[PDB]
């Protein structure tokens, strides 16, 4: 069931021997990241968003839909990224998780950047969408994994890319573990350094993305990170296939 | 203009190639990959979406035309309906759903078998009449399962002229391509674009042939069923195991 299916997606969150997801879009694809060994799978919003014609501009009811295939395709665990929560107000995304949670998904990412500008969210704003997403859950009795994801790297240069904004990504992971969340992602980050220290302070689990060859896969597991993902990269690549199908003739 | 286009291209000895898209996404892929006009395939549109209904297929159908300019050709399979009427009714959903052709089969879908010639070509008649009664420039490729249906001993001058008689009964229905896959033998590719009523569609098994040998068979039209699909997912499958 699915209090199963979120405990095991839970007991995954290892640091030092970190859940490795990619991203599907489709229960085609959620089949074959199954069927290569995966133990759990995530959806990405790019992702999805790319492979139904869109650039939150996928409607929340079409992107649930997704999801229910995506659920239904294999037994694994599944994470839905949910953007911002896809809501104004914060029992505007607790209506949202409470939806991935009917739609069978047992955790989400919830960002805490405004889609109107990029930008991020103050603190507490942030943290009181993740309060009603626990919440949400919560009154559905269930095991469900709220990874917060801060966008503090992931707008700013990597050239500046210091001690300050670790300080600032630190106090929202506090903030956001108080709140209820249960994991802590920080996409745009590539540091060593960084994501020691991060590693080493933060209240919980950490999840970092691989974009470059480096820092690897063993890198990052002895950094002590706890949760690896990849964005849009296998879908891109799959799509790099059928182009280049397409211009060899093939 | 779109139909038109997609017409123009089925030329004997310049074929059209098709790849077989089964979302927004792919659809878009291709077009910018530099295709000329795309197609929808029913098995990798079944696979992607974890399989069909006919309302299924039209939803992804018209997401995957609104997501470039470029010419849709649907496959329908056997037509999506009991008697005639009905496969009507399947057409003029692909039209409102802005796809300017189709591909339709002459089999049973629960059983494979062949319908007798005149009741295929009804359903092509209702097919061309639907079409017609929209004012559109439409493309029915009348897909024969002949070679497909038949074991590969009997593939001989007989079965073409099985394929050939079909053919003629389908053109006077309406049809405008002819579709034969299971159909590999270089001497009976050449016989069949020799003496086809209608631009004539082959489907590629292997790599080789290439698109230049195929085309000087005269061949109009050349597909490649669920290849595209699986090559993606053997990327995605790969990339999982390397980590
Ligand atoms: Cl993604
Ligand atoms: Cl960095
Ligand atoms: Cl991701
Ligand atoms: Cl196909
Ligand atoms: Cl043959
Ligand atoms: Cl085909």
């Known amino acids: 069931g699915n209090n199963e299916k979120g405990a095991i997606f839970r007991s995954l969150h290892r640091a030092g021997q970190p859940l490795a997801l990619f991203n599907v879009w489709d229960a085609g694809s959620a ?9 759990a799978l995530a959806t990405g919003s790019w992702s999805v968003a790319a492979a ?11 992107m649930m839909e997704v999801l229910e295939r995506i659920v239904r395709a294999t037994d694994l665990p599944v994470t839905v990224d949910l953007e911002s929560g896809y809501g104004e107000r914060p029992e505007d995304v607790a209506e949202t998780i409470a939806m991935s949670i009917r739609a069978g998904a047992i955790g989400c990412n919830l960002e805490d950047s405004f889609p109107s500008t990029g930008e991020l969210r103050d603190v507490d704003e942030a943290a009181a969408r993740i309060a009603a997403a626990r919440q949400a859950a919560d009154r559905a009795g269930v095991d469900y994994f709220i990874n917060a994801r801060t966008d503090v790297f992931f707008k700013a240069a990597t050239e500046t890319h210091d001690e300050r904004l670790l300080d600032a990504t630190l106090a929202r992971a506090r903030a956001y573990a108080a709140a209820g969340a249960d994991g802590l992602f920080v996409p745009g980050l590539r540091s060593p350094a960084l994501i020691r220290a991060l590693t080493a302070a933060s209240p919980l689990p950490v999840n970092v993305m691989r974009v470059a060859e480096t820092p690897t896969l063993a890198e990052l597991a002895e950094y002590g990170v706890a949760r690896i993902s990849h964005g849009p990269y296998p879908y891109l690549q799959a799509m790099k296939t059928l182009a280049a199908l397409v211009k060899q003739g093939g």
């Open 52 to 62: 139904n014609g869109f650039v939150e501009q996928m409607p929340r009811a079409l």
């Open 31 to 39: 089949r074959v990241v199954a069927d290569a060994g995966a133990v």
